[PDB]
């Protein structure tokens, strides 16, 4: 029910606010920032990550 995304690739945070995750990790998608940045939470940590780096299990209401 909760929109979640699957980490298709490894994403290491290089900037402040970026959400780091490893390949195969499930991120709790909660919002969209723009056409390339997604907002979500992982292990309690909140931040943004690229849309083309993850898979969409449950799409957002549109």
């Amino acid at each position: 029910d909760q929109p979640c995304c699957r980490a298709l690739y490894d994403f290491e945070p290089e900037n402040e606010g970026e959400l780091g995750f490893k390949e195969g990790d499930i991120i709790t998608l909660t919002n969209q920032i723009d056409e390339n940045w997604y907002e979500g939470m992982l292990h309690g940590q909140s931040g943004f990550f690229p849309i083309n780096y993850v898979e969409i299990l449950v799409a957002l209401p549109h």
Partner: protein
């Protein structure tokens, strides 16, 4: 050598490269194709992000290998 480039798509287009080809070059191939800055493109192979100054014979890139090249946004 043939390498399959995938840009956020399901499939991958085969590009003919050589042993001394650098990642930068492979990136430019997509840059001129999608009209996207080469400095904003990243190459991922086998769950590993390849460094721009890396060459074919300096990585685990072999014949008929597929790579995922996409535009990685940066917020600064």
């Amino acid at each position: 050598m043939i390498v399959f480039v995938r840009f956020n798509s399901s499939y991958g287009f085969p590009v003919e490269v050589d042993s001394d080809t650098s990642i930068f070059q492979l990136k430019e191939v997509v840059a001129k194709r999608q009209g996207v800055p080469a400095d904003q493109l990243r190459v991922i192979f086998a769950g590993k992000e390849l460094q721009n100054h890396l060459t074919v014979q300096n990585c685990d890139l072999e014949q008929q290998s597929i790579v995922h090249i996409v535009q990685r946004p940066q917020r600064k």
